[PDB]
From a paper:
We also solved the structure of each unligated APL to investigate whether structural changes occurred before or after binding — which, combined with an in-depth cellular and biophysical analysis of the 1E6 interaction with each APL, demonstrated the molecular mechanism mediating the high level of cross-reactivity exhibited by this preproinsulin-reactive human CD8+ T cell clone. The unligated structures of A2-AQWGPDAAA, A2-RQWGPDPAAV, A2-YQFGPDFPIA, and A2-RQFGPDFPTI were virtually identical when in complex with 1E6. Conversely, the stronger-affinity ligands A2-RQWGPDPAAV (KD = 7.8 μM), A2-YQFGPDFPIA (KD = 7.4 μM), and A2-RQFGPDFPTI (KD = 0.5 μM) exhibited favorable entropy (TΔS° = 2.2 to 14.9 kcal/mol), indicating an order-to-disorder change during binding, possibly through the expulsion of ordered water molecules. Furthermore, the structures of the unligated pMHCs demonstrated that, for these stronger-affinity ligands, there was less conformational difference between the TCR ligated pMHCs compared with the weaker-affinity ligands.
We demonstrated that the TCR from the 1E6 T cell clone bound to HLA-A*0201–ALWGPDPAAA using a limited footprint and very weak binding affinity. Here, we solved the structure of the 1E6 TCR with 7 altered peptide ligands (APLs) determined by our previously published combinatorial peptide library (CPL) screening, 2 of which mapped within human pathogens. Concomitant with our global analysis of 1E6 TCR binding to the APLs, we observed a common interaction element, consistent with our previous findings, that utilized TCR residues Tyr97α and Trp97β, forming an aromatic cap over a central GPD motif that was present in all of the APLs. Ligand engagement is dominated by peptide interactions, but hotspot-like interactions with the central GPD motif enable the 1E6 TCR to tolerate peptide residues that vary outside of this region, explaining how T cells expressing this TCR may cross-react with a large number of different peptides.
Author numbering:
A (entry chain B): 0 to 99
B (entry chain A): 0 to 276
C (entry chain C): 1 to 10
Write the structure that this text describes.
């Protein structure tokens, strides 16, 4: 049947201010089937304390999940979301851009 | 607020390798999740996800747990039935999804009900708007439809959707009114990003809003513009509110011609933003 | 409050 690949947005809960606590979000949507792997990364390393929302779906039956963790943005640290799904040959990495 | 919904979402995923399907149920009022069940969680109970449901007493939680576990077993049976209807191997994993719910309208009375079911992410069977007839997508679903017609399933569902569903939606709306009946209008602002010496991007931001429904549009000299624009999918903040942005590329120096127009239930009149800071 | 007692099987 259908396989639909995830859309991915990486963003902060609050406006990012260097040195100030916040939450880093990776929102994955539009995927099918529901099995999916999502990590948040800091300078390429997986963050262990990440939580996620309960599985739900949209009008077109596609799934969505929010993965998140508490973080402190800085000028130099890089954050990203890494996603694997049956539709992907290799994991997809999407870097966080604070303006997006 | 002026229409409201209660909706339940259910997903079962078969595990041909070993064991029972994974089953996850969630309930919402509007865009607020208030209960969950996960077959892999330790409690094996329907659990609260909003503070205003916590005051429901043990009879409630027992009944809701009983219903949701029975539902999970029904999807377990269904996954086997569907594999037979479609002549599929025992080897692959497959998915069932169900959503049902009811809306109250602006007059606070029943507006509509629905119940939709999907197999492997495609429509399977759905209740029609009249709450009396079914839409079957294919001849497997037509077998289910005949079964359900003969068993008066629509009559039983309809009674729920028009009765209990509406009544309990209204109860939750009152018990949770401090948040459920508060509109959070978007907090809006614009940013400016040079793209070259000749062009710039204006980005119109809508933050911290509830409910999720929102419309962002750009106009140039008071006429809607979609060319040279980009809109992201509305996204959760993680605190129960939502975010969105829309952007337009413009000739450097002409920013003031452009306006971002924001419509939301929390705004008595739409907001209009303009780069003139 | 969910629809009960249990949906009909397909």
């Amino acid at each position: 049947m259908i396989q639909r690949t995830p859309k991915i947005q990486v963003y902060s809960r609050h406006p990012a201010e260097n040195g100030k606590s916040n939450f880093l979000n990776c929102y994955v949507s539009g995927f099918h089937p529901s099995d999916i792997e999502v990590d948040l990364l800091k300078n390429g390393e997986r963050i262990e304390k990440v939580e996620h929302s309960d599985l739900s779906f949209s009008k077109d039956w596609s799934f969505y999940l929010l993965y998140y963790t508490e973080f402190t943005p800085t000028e130099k640290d890089e954050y990203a979301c890494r996603v694997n799904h049956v539709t992907l040959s290799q994991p997809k990495i999407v870097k966080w851009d604070r303006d997006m | 607020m002026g229409s409201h919904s209660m909706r339940y979402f259910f997903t079962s995923v078969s595990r041909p390798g070993r064991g029972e399907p994974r089953f996850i149920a969630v309930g919402y009022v509007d865009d607020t999740q208030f209960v969950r069940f996960d077959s892999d969680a330790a409690s094996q109970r329907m659990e609260p996800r909003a503070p205003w449901i916590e005051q429901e007493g043990p009879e409630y939680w027992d009944g809701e747990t009983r219903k949701v576990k029975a539902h999970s077993q029904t999807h377990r049976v269904d996954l086997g039935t569907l594999r037979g209807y479609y002549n599929q191997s025992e080897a692959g994993s497959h998915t069932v999804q169900r959503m049902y719910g009811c809306d109250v309208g602006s007059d606070w009375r029943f507006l509509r009900g629905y119940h939709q079911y999907a197999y492997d992410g495609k429509d399977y069977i759905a209740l029609k708007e009249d709450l009396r007839s079914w839409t079957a997508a294919d001849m497997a679903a037509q077998t289910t439809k005949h079964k359900w017609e003969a068993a008066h399933v629509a009559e039983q569902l309809r009674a729920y959707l028009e009765g209990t569903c509406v009544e309990w939606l209204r109860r939750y709306l009152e018990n949770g009114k401090e948040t459920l009946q508060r509109t959070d209008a978007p907090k809006t602002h614009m940013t400016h990003h040079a793209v070259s010496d000749h062009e710039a991007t204006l980005r119109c931001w809508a933050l911290s809003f509830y409910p999720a429904e929102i419309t962002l549009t750009w106009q140039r000299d008071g006429e809607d513009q979609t060319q040279d624009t980009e809109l992201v999918e509305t996204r959760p903040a993680g605190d129960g509110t939502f975010q969105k942005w829309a952007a337009v590329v413009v000739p450097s120096g002409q920013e003031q011609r452009y306006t971002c127009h924001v419509q939301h239930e929390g705004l008595p009149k739409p907001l209009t933003l303009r780069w003139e800071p | 409050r969910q629809w009960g007692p249990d949906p009909a099987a397909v």
